[PDB]
Design a protein around this motif. Structure first.
Motif, PDB file in Angstrom:
ATOM      1  N   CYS A 254       1.338  -1.091   0.082  1.00 38.98           N
ATOM      2  CA  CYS A 254      -0.156   0.069  -0.036  1.00 38.98           C
ATOM      3  C   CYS A 254       0.987   1.349  -0.167  1.00 38.98           C
ATOM      4  O   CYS A 254       1.764   1.602   0.643  1.00 38.98           O
ATOM      5  CB  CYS A 254      -1.148   0.091   1.125  1.00 38.98           C
ATOM      6  SG  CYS A 254      -2.092  -1.368   1.411  1.00 38.98           S
TER       7      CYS A 254
ATOM      8  N   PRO B 203       3.520  -4.033   3.891  1.00 40.69           N
ATOM      9  CA  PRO B 203       2.422  -4.237   3.862  1.00 40.69           C
ATOM     10  C   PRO B 203       2.254  -1.994   3.502  1.00 40.69           C
ATOM     11  O   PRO B 203       0.779  -1.785   2.819  1.00 40.69           O
ATOM     12  CB  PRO B 203       1.860  -3.741   5.447  1.00 40.69           C
ATOM     13  CG  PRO B 203       3.443  -4.282   5.992  1.00 40.69           C
ATOM     14  CD  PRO B 203       4.290  -4.454   5.110  1.00 40.69           C
ATOM     15  N   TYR B 204       3.355  -1.508   3.686  1.00 45.89           N
ATOM     16  CA  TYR B 204       4.111  -0.491   2.889  1.00 45.89           C
ATOM     17  C   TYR B 204       4.935  -0.326   1.595  1.00 45.89           C
ATOM     18  O   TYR B 204       5.554  -0.736   1.036  1.00 45.89           O
ATOM     19  CB  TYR B 204       3.642   0.359   3.490  1.00 45.89           C
ATOM     20  CG  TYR B 204       2.181   0.787   4.212  1.00 45.89           C
ATOM     21  CD1 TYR B 204       1.537   1.918   3.574  1.00 45.89           C
ATOM     22  CD2 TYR B 204       2.587   0.734   5.458  1.00 45.89           C
ATOM     23  CE1 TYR B 204       0.314   1.506   4.675  1.00 45.89           C
ATOM     24  CE2 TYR B 204       0.476   0.358   6.000  1.00 45.89           C
ATOM     25  CZ  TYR B 204      -0.146   1.613   6.205  1.00 45.89           C
ATOM     26  OH  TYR B 204      -1.401   1.340   6.086  1.00 45.89           O
TER      27      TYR B 204
ATOM     28  N   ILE C 188      -2.882 -10.198   2.464  1.00 52.83           N
ATOM     29  CA  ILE C 188      -1.005  -8.671   1.648  1.00 52.83           C
ATOM     30  C   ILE C 188      -0.076  -8.994   1.496  1.00 52.83           C
ATOM     31  O   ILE C 188       0.429  -9.009   0.306  1.00 52.83           O
ATOM     32  CB  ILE C 188      -1.690  -7.410   2.302  1.00 52.83           C
ATOM     33  CG1 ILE C 188      -2.825  -6.738   2.328  1.00 52.83           C
ATOM     34  CG2 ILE C 188      -1.166  -6.353   1.653  1.00 52.83           C
ATOM     35  CD1 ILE C 188      -3.396  -5.515   3.121  1.00 52.83           C
TER      36      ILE C 188
HETATM   37 MN   LIG Z   1      -2.787  -1.812   3.404  1.00 52.73          MN
END
Ligand SMILES: [Mn+2]
Ligand SMILES: [Ca+2]
Ligand SMILES: [Mn+2]
Ligand SMILES: [Mn+2]
Ligand SMILES: [Mn+2]
Length: 344
Positions: free
Chosen positions: A79, A147-148, A324
């Motif tokens: 993300c 996640p990022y 994710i």
């Molecule tokens: Mn996310």
DNA sequence: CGCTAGTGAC
DNA sequence: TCTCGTCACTAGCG
């Protein structure tokens, strides 16, 4: 990437080979190999044709690492950070602009010169990354979607003792406080290792060899999270921190023009931007593969309110973050695209 | 003289 | 990841 940080700290650089980490685990910033691989097939990609040259390009390095008895961990971006949203959409519109100006004006106007704006509009989508993930898992190589930003994830993997070194081309990893970073690695396995402990070998660095001060230096010199001041680079910022004796960094940032004998007026937003950049380098949300939960890069200190660190990433449920990380869940549509399970 | 920033090429 | 990077130039600041 930090502007010429590698050249600055050359004294701490050490030419090595991957064989050094034989029988050990090394995390890999796969985005670099993906970007380098999306060049020899950039045309066929932008045309709308299914090509897998970048896949084999990444798998070349992967098999190369495997040939020296190394266990690679391919890490991918997830993300987009809430701060780098506008920048992402801006670069997106720029790529759309090049793609638009490279379809009619260069295909009918200047046919002999079509591959000019047709090769400057490339984006590493999640689809391509997943195409690499499948091929990587098919060889038994572990994969882990951050996640990022993959930078923080790699930094965690190195700082947690899970992996020994970090293979990348991005200079941001040094600012995250990694202990081992392998840069400029070619196809044969020859790269440059930068050990954190050897940061003291840099005479020009001074007493800015601690992780915190080094971080401050990298941020003050300019980075993704914050642009540099006019006439400010590595040398001058390093000088600022080297001539500083104040525990509080804020006051130093206020007196930056006083320390460098320069006529520099400090913007009010630049202070907050510095605070956010530092808090991003410190407490960016990463994914713990062991405890299987979503935690920041470092433990929260005393002088930080966790409920104000929205720019450094937002929390999601552990199961969602798990889906994710595995690559089963699409980043955009938030729906399951794969049914891969690590326990089966 | 050195630093910074911007240009030119692979 | 502000070509993606590399380095020589170099202009221009201080
Ligand atoms: Mn996310
Ligand atoms: Ca000092
Ligand atoms: Mn960066
Ligand atoms: Mn990155
Ligand atoms: Mn980065």
């Amino acid at each position: 990437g930090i502007q010429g940080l590698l050249q600055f700290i050359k004294e701490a650089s050490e030419p090595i080979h991957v064989r050094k980490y034989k029988g050990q685990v090394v995390a890999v910033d796969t985005y670099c190999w993906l970007h380098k691989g999306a060049i020899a097939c950039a045309e066929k990609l932008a045309k709308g044709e299914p090509t897998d040259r970048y896949v084999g390009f990444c798998m070349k390095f992967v098999n190369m690492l495997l040939s020296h008895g190394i266990k690679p961990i391919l890490v991918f971006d997830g993300c987009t950070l809430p701060s780098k949203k506008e920048v992402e959409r801006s670069a997106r519109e720029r790529r759309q602009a090049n793609l638009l100006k490279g379809k009619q004006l260069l295909r009918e106007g200047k046919v002999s010169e079509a591959r000019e704006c047709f090769t400057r509009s490339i984006n590493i989508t999640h689809a391509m990354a997943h195409k690499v993930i499948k091929a990587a898992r098919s060889q038994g190589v572990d994969c882990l979607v951050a996640p990022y930003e993959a930078d923080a994830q790699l930094a965690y993997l190195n700082k947690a003792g899970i992996v020994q070194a970090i293979i990348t081309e991005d200079s941001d990893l040094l600012a995250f406080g990694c202990k081992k970073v392998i840069l400029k690695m070619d196809q044969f396995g020859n790269g440059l290792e930068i050990d954190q402990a050897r940061l003291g070998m840099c005479r020009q660095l001074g007493d800015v060899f601690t992780e915190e001060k080094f971080r401050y230096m990298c941020i003050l010199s300019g980075c993704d999270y914050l642009s540099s001041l006019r006439g400010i680079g590595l040398a001058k910022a390093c000088k600022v921190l080297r001539l500083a004796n104040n525990p509080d960094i804020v006051k130093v940032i206020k007196k930056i023009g006083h320390y460098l004998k320069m006529n520099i007026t400090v913007p009010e937003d630049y202070i907050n931007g510095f605070i956010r950049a530092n808090n991003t380098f410190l407490y960016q949300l990463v994914f713990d593969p062991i405890k299987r939960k979503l935690i920041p890069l470092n433990a929260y200190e005393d002088d930080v309110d966790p409920e104000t660190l929205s720019y450094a990433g937002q929390y999601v449920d552990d199961s969602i973050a798990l889906q994710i990380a595995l690559g089963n869940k699409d980043i955009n549509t938030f729906e399951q695209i794969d049914d891969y399970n690590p326990d089966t």
